[PDB]
Design a protein around this ligand. Structure first.
Ligand code: VZB
Ligand code: VZB
Lengths: 306, 306
């Protein structure tokens, strides 16, 4: 028993992290086979970053301008190209530690692990969710760009995020590994802002089921509700709508606990309308929305990875 | 910016995890050089575990009774011995992935990363603190025994915890890597209970400094207090006493924020006496006590590991 915000083991990704330096700028790259991926703003300098034209900036660059550090071994760059907001640096050595991998793009509401890195060296690992407004609430300092987010499925790493920037409210924005930004953000230094966020309703319900599985039951009740009547309550409290597909996804957790999904919705309603009255749920005094139904089943059942 | 519960990269420990099976029991082992460490209750069966005599049970065992799985490679056991509550299985192959390491015992209030494992395969990684009552609030299921806790300092892994058991309140107990239990627990199936816990005061203050560094300032005030007057408030709210050494350890964080330690104590007092009034601090509606001053400095400054 117990419930923690759990990341995937990071070993498979650690073996892919490299340092990329161009001019004044040092950031992280992801080395898979004979390509290093990194944010294209590495080719920028502090006055380039106000409003750059990256095609113009990149044609002015040479292979030898890119210094790639694989620990204490330098990688020879033999080609470079730009793919949307990422650079692909072709090197003359394939990474012998390349895991099986996929480039996937995730949906708002889904979770992933982040391996935060500085100078190509991993610093720590933590779990994030993609917010509905396409930001992530991360922990990133100067030099963390190019750190990646990922999930692991048995032995395959699905890379879903590469870090590019911090917005003025302290939240973070970045791209998938094809270089396409999540959300309406651009890799320029102009006034950008996150935009209004909402709470991920289906994840809150999943976490309430995790609490029941772990013996926290005080928030349960005999009442029930309809999906439509629940969603009127969700709208007022800035929760996003619950769909029938969400109800279906919660089915396993419903069946394991014997608590009908719509019954747990009735409990959430009372929690939204009444607060928590000085009590806690799974060690939290807030309704937590960064665990997916998959996360709960994985943790409350013991799935591993090889 | 941002503040997350961050674990250490787990790659160095993943390469040490093996599966140990004896009779009916399968658990995890830690393979360093030519020794595999694991909980000694692997030699038990379900009626042995009520009240066993481990010396009697172990003399009845043979090397060939211990089946050690290093992924899809079997390790030949060539000797076995017991050290307190851990077994040391000598194998004929040194682990080529052995990191530089140390066996250290931690203090209540300190933090570490846990690599949860099943059948020798890592499942996830998360950060824990050793509670004042010597339990940890983990996430562990059947088969997780032998998963280890650790810190990394540059390139050296300091192993501090090996998992043995779950207590009736859902918290967890285990040993250091010398096999000595943290706290007054024993590896038998008899009525044991955690005992009363307290909040780790110095860690709460560290986390309040992390919040200031990240722009959460609403809980600050112009008042101050003396160390003695603070500790009278801490006693009532079941916080442990703050010492002058704690004040000294908080010095760096005090100097970076310009908020005197005793001033932050005055803020904590008002938070304890008034609650939080519907607001949050670093995304939490509770006072968080599982970040050490070191954890805050590491995260709010960007230290890496090679
Ligand atoms: C890359 O290491 C760095 C990571 C930032 C620094 C602080 N926290 C982080 O996550 N990214 C940048 O420096 C980017 C680069 C320059 C400006 N950056 C910012 O993060 C500044 O934040 C603003 C957000 C919207 C308005 C413009 C940028 C770009 C975006 C090229
Ligand atoms: C080892 O994989 C297992 C891990 C437990 C199972 C559930 N969650 C966990 O962390 N440990 C045990 O099964 C130990 C073994 C047998 C009983 N165990 C318990 O955890 C049962 O909990 C009780 C706690 C105090 C009273 C006796 C045990 C021992 C302790 C040998």
């Amino acid at each position: 028993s117990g419930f923690r915000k759990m990341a995937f083991p990071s070993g498979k990704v650690e073996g892919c992290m490299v340092q990329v330096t161009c001019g004044t700028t040092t950031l992280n790259g992801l080395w898979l086979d004979d390509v290093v991926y990194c944010p294209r703003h590495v080719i920028c300098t502090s006055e380039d970053m106000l409003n750059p034209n990256y095609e113009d900036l990149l044609i002015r660059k040479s292979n030898h301008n890119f210094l790639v550090q694989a620990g204490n071994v330098q990688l020879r760059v033999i080609g470079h190209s730009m793919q949307n907001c990422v650079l692909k640096l072709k090197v003359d050595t394939a990474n012998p530690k390349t895991p099986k991998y996929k480039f996937v793009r995730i949906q708002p509401g889904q979770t992933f692990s982040v391996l935060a890195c500085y100078n190509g060296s991993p610093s720590g690992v933590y779990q994030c969710a993609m917010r509905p407004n396409f930001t992530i609430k991360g922990s990133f300092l100067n030099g963390s760009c190019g750190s990646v987010g990922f999930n692991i499925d048995y032995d395959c790493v699905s890379f879903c995020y590469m870090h590019h920037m911090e917005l003025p409210t302290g939240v973070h924005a970045g791209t998938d590994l094809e270089g396409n930004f999540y959300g309406p953000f651009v890799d320029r230094q102009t006034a950008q802002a996150a935009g209004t966020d909402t709470t991920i309703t289906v994840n809150v319900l999943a976490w309430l089921y995790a609490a029941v599985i772990n013996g926290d039951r005080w928030f349960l009740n005999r009442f029930t509700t309809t999906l439509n009547d629940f969603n009127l309550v969700a709208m007022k409290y800035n929760y996003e709508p619950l769909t029938q597909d969400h109800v279906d996804i919660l089915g396993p957790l419903s069946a394991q606990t014997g608590i009908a999904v719509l019954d747990m919705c009735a409990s959430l309603k009372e929690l939204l309308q009444n607060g928590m009255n000085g009590r806690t749920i799974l060690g939290s005094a807030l309704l937590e929305d960064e665990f997916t139904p998959f996360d709960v089943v994985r943790q409350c059942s013991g799935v591993t990875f090889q």
